[PDB]
Each structure stands twice: as C-alpha cells, then as structure tokens.
Design a protein around this ligand. Structure first.
Ligand SMILES: CNc1cc(OC)c(C(=O)N[C@@H]2CCN(Cc3ccccc3)[C@@H]2C)cc1Cl
Ligand SMILES: CCCCCCCC/C=C/CCCCCCCC(=O)O
Ligand SMILES: CCCCCCCC/C=C/CCCCCCCC(=O)O
Ligand SMILES: CCCCCCCC/C=C/CCCCCCCC(=O)O
Ligand SMILES: CCCCCCCC/C=C/CCCCCCCC(=O)O
Ligand SMILES: CCCCCCCC/C=C\CCCCCCCC(=O)O
Ligand SMILES: CCCCCCCC/C=C\CCCCCCCC(=O)O
Ligand SMILES: CCCCCCCC/C=C\CCCCCCCC(=O)O
Ligand SMILES: CCCCCCCC/C=C\CCCCCCCC(=O)O
Ligand code: NA
Length: 379
C-alpha cells in the first residue's frame, strides 16, 4: 500500500532523473550553441542529479518500501547519508557558483589575447565539489548513537542546514539580483535601432558569402559600414556619464574603428572587382566581431539578460523543493520537542529529490537554445 506507491513513485522518479539529465549532458556535448560558460555549471548540476539517481535514490526507495526501516549495514548507511548530504550541498553550491560566475562576467569586462575561455568555470566547479565534500565528510566518520538511516547528530544537521542552505541562499539571491541590475545598466534605450544595425551586419555578411558579383559585395559592405557607424553611436547607460576622453569610451569607439577599417579594406577590394578577396576579408570580419563586438552587442541589446531568464526559474524551483526539507530538519535538530509528523518528513524528502527531475524540463521550457535542440529531436 504505502510500499507500492514508494516503489512506483521511486522507479518513475529514478527513470525521470536519469532520462532528463543524461539528455542534458549529451545535448551540451553534441550542440555547439550549448557549449557556454554558464552551461558548464548546468552540466555540473546534471552530474549531481545523475549521481543522486545512481547512488542514493535506489536505496532510498528500498528504504521507503520497508517503511523507513533500514535493514542493511550501519556503515553503508553512513556512506549513503554522506553522499546524500554532498549531492544536495553540491547542487546548492553550484547554483551559488553560477551567480558568482555571472556576476563577475558582468561586473568585470575582460578581453583575452588568445583563443578560448580561461576554464575558470571548470576550476570553480572543481572548487564547488571539493567544498561540498568537505561539508559532508564528517558523516562518513559515523555520527549516530539504530535500525533506521537518519542523521541523528543535531549539531551536524544545524551546521549543514546553515552552510549548505540557509546561508548560500540569501547570498545567491543578492548576487543574481546585482547581476541582473548590472546588465540592465548596459542596455541602451534605443534597443530596436541597435537590433536593426545588428541585423544589417549579419544579413549582409550572408549576402556577401553568396554574392554573384562585385557590385553586390560592394553594396552589402556599404550597408555594413553605415550600420557599424550607427552602432558605434549607441552608448550604454554604463558609459553615458563617462567623458568622451574616458579610457572606457576610447575602448568602446575603438572596437568599431577596427571593424569599419576592415569593412573599408573589403570595400576597396570589392570596388576593384576582387570578389574572392573581398569575401575572405569579410569572413575575416566575421571573426573580429566574433569576440570584440558581438559579445557586448548581446549585452547592450538586452539579449544577454534575456538568456539568463532560465536561471531564476532553476533557483526558484530549487527553493520551492528544498526549503520545506531544510525547515523541517533544522527544526527537529534545534528542537527535539518540536515533533514533525513522520509522513511529512517523508514528504519533504521526496519533494527535495523530485527537484532532480525538474531542471531538464525547466531548460526545455524556459531557455531558447535548449528548447531549440529539443524541438529538433523530431528526427
Ligand atoms: C545538505 N544538508 C543535508 C542534506 C540531507 O539530505 C539531502 C540531510 C538528511 O537528513 N538526509 C536524510 C538522511 C538519508 N536521506 C534519505 C535516504 C537516502 C538513502 C538511503 C536511505 C535514506 C534523508 C533525506 C540532512 C542535511 Cl543537514
Ligand atoms: C521566476 C521565479 C521562480 C519561479 C518558481 C520556479 C518554479 C519552477 C517550476 C516549474 C514549473 C513551471 C510551470 C509554468 C508553466 C508556464 C510557463 C510559461 O507560461 O512560459
Ligand atoms: C520561492 C519562489 C522563488 C524564489 C526565487 C526567485 C528567483 C531567484 C532569483 C532572484 C534574483 C532576481 C533576478 C531578477 C529576476 C527577473 C529578471 C529580470 O526581471 O530582469
Ligand atoms: C530561503 C528561505 C529561507 C527561510 C528561512 C526561515 C526558515 C528557518 C526557520 C526555522 C527555525 C525553526 C525554529 C525551531 C525552534 C528552535 C528553538 C530552540 O532552539 O529551542
Ligand atoms: C535538449 C533539451 C534538454 C534535454 C532534454 C530534456 C528532457 C526532458 C524534456 C521533456 C519535457 C517535456 C515537457 C514539456 C515540453 C516542452 C517543449 C516545448 O515547450 O515546446
Ligand atoms: C516522473 C516524476 C515522478 C515523481 C515521483 C514523486 C512522487 C513519489 C511519491 C512516493 C510516495 C510516498 C510514499 C513513501 C512512504 O511510504 O513513506
Ligand atoms: C564526483 C562528482 C563529479 C563531478 C562531475 C562534474 C563535472 C562537470 C564539469 C564539466 C563541464 C562541462 C563543460 C562543457 C562546456 O564547456 O560547456
Ligand atoms: C559556494 C560557497 C557557498 C557559500 C556558503 C558556504 C559556506 C560554508 C563553507 C563550507 C565549510 C567547510 C568546512 C570544512 C572544514 O571544517 O574544514
Ligand atoms: C564573492 C561574491 C562575488 C565577489 C566578486 C566581487 C568582484 C568585484 C568586481 C569589481 C568590479 C571591477 C570593475 C571596475 O571597478 O573597474
Ligand atoms: Na540536485
């Protein structure tokens, strides 16, 4: 009765965690549009969820069929609980790492000399996992004084409730808040104008790629030049009060000067009838914007802020799913006499674990790139 619901519910939960989260990892692996700094953390979150389904949920379900009785070794129980605590902590610490990472990307504009990221996200992810293991490590040493698998050490439970949850949460919330406000300060008033300029650039690079002749190339380059110059005049509020002589204003203007200079050289070539050379100059121009310009066009048009919309939904769902769990557990640990109904302890646990099945759904619905890869699984 109570056992059959756990079994069916558990097999369905485990199936849904493995299915959804493997499809996330494979998608980041197969689709170039998904290989971003942010999605490195999303893969880390997927790993945490896959590991939960592999290492924790099966014996959790088995436990639930036995009505919470634990018939196996007490050392195995300790091993399970330490893994339980670590994976929970790792999910939270990774949501925290995202907000730290995104705040820094926003607050600290950097341009590298060489190809690729710094892999600082990977280092931060490594740090996140080692920190989660550090929080969980004492559980492995055996904290209990029976036939059930529970954390009975009240000081440990309060400690981890605070470190793993009640402390990261407000800080994470403050950081997401600062991050979103930071980006907004970069978004120009005349968004649609700058989007037009941006489309002119991309549409005409494609016209150039397939041109029949030099005049088409020259016409396309001429439009690009005008759009580059317009875009150059779209100043973000972030730099509005910055003087014309400011080294941050001198930066801004410069990226567009390099661009206009490249367009001019391609123009000279097209004008002389050198189609292939003009097309190569323009392709070489698809790489100068690939880093210097386009990164911060997505920023100043509001695209970047829009693409971050999936993150609060993920954070939100995590808070909905785990807040009841941590309120129940810290209460019990602080106040033995504050009796929580066992059926509710069971409920908030399942609620916590079902979070692990939710993120793949959240990405599919609320993020455009993920939604896109998904919707072309119609093959
Ligand atoms: C990150 N902080 C914590 C996380 C916990 O579990 C996710 C718990 C917790 O009490 N977990 C219990 C301990 C075992 N776990 C369920 C389970 C897992 C595997 C086999 C049997 C029972 C329960 C949900 C406590 C803390 Cl402080
Ligand atoms: C935005 C702050 C966080 C909000 C709470 C997060 C909970 C996420 C849970 C997932 C279920 C969402 C179901 C909503 C479906 C409608 C979405 C839509 O209309 O585009
Ligand atoms: C418990 C319900 C959900 C609580 C969490 C809500 C979402 C967590 C993130 C909050 C940081 C605020 C970021 C702004 C979100 C909207 C984006 C925007 O309007 O620019
Ligand atoms: C992210 C959402 C944050 C929500 C914070 C509120 C949750 C914390 C409340 C739980 C404390 C329960 C108090 C238990 C009584 C302790 C009294 C005693 O120690 O004797
Ligand atoms: C490639 C996308 C991410 C990896 C796959 C995720 C696996 C779980 C997705 C299935 C959820 C289906 C329910 C809602 C479908 C939303 C599709 C849509 O909005 O058009
Ligand atoms: C696909 C998603 C599957 C969602 C499954 C979540 C709900 C399972 C609830 C299990 C029933 C609780 C009984 C446990 C008990 O006996 O104490
Ligand atoms: C034990 C826990 C094992 C931790 C597994 C976590 C690894 C996630 C790091 C890999 C991130 C993928 C990078 C893809 C990308 O560049 O977008
Ligand atoms: C991501 C960071 C989240 C910020 C809140 C976390 C702070 C708690 C830090 C973990 C404490 C580890 C103790 C290990 C030890 O005793 O050496
Ligand atoms: C820990 C949580 C995040 C800590 C990060 C703080 C970084 C502060 C960024 C400073 C902005 C540099 C840009 C400038 O002032 O010129
Ligand atoms: Na998780």
């Amino acid at each position: 009765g109570q056992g059959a619901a756990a079994l069916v519910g558990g097999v369905l939960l485990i199936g849904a965690v493995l299915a959804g989260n493997s499809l996330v990892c494979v998608s980041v692996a197969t689709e170039r549009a998904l290989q971003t700094p942010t999605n490195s953390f999303i893969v880390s979150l997927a790993a945490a969820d896959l590991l939960l389904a592999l290492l924790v949920l099966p014996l959790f379900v088995y436990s639930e069929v036995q009505g919470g009785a634990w018939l196996l070794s007490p050392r195995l129980c300790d091993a399970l609980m330490a893994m339980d605590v670590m994976l929970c902590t790792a999910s939270i610490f990774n949501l925290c790492a995202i907000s730290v990472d995104r705040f820094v990307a926003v607050a600290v504009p950097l341009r590298y000399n060489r190809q690729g990221g710094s892999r600082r996200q990977l280092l931060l992810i490594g740090a996140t996992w080692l920190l989660s293991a550090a929080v969980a490590a004492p559980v492995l040493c055996g904290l209990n004084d029976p036939a059930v698998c529970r954390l009975e050490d009240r000081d440990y439970v309060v400690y981890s409730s605070v470190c793993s949850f009640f402390l990261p949460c407000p800080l994470m919330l403050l950081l997401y808040w600062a991050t979103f406000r930071g980006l907004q300060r970069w978004e120009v008033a005349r968004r649609a104008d700058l989007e037009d300029n941006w489309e002119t650039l991309n549409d005409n690079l494609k016209v150039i790629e397939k041109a029949d002749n030099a005049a088409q190339v020259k016409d396309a380059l001429t439009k690009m030049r005008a759009a580059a110059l317009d875009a150059q005049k779209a100043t973000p509020p972030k730099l509005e009060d910055k003087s014309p002589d400011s080294p941050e204003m001198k930066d801004f203007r410069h990226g567009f000067d390099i661009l206009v200079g490249q367009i001019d050289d391609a123009l000279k070539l097209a004008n002389e009838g050198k189609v292939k050379e003009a097309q190569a100059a323009a392709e070489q121009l698809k790489t100068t914007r690939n880093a210097y310009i386009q990164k911060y066009l997505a920023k100043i048009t509001g695209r970047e802020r829009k693409a971050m919309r999936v993150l609060p939904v993920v954070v939100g769902a995590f808070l909905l799913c785990w807040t009841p769990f941590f309120v129940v557990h810290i209460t019990q640990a602080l106040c033995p006499a504050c009796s929580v109904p066992p059926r509710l302890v069971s409920a908030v646990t399942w609620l916590g674990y079902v979070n692990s099945a939710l993120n793949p759904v959240i990405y599919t619905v609320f993020n455009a790139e993920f939604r896109n890869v998904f919707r072309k699984a119609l093959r």
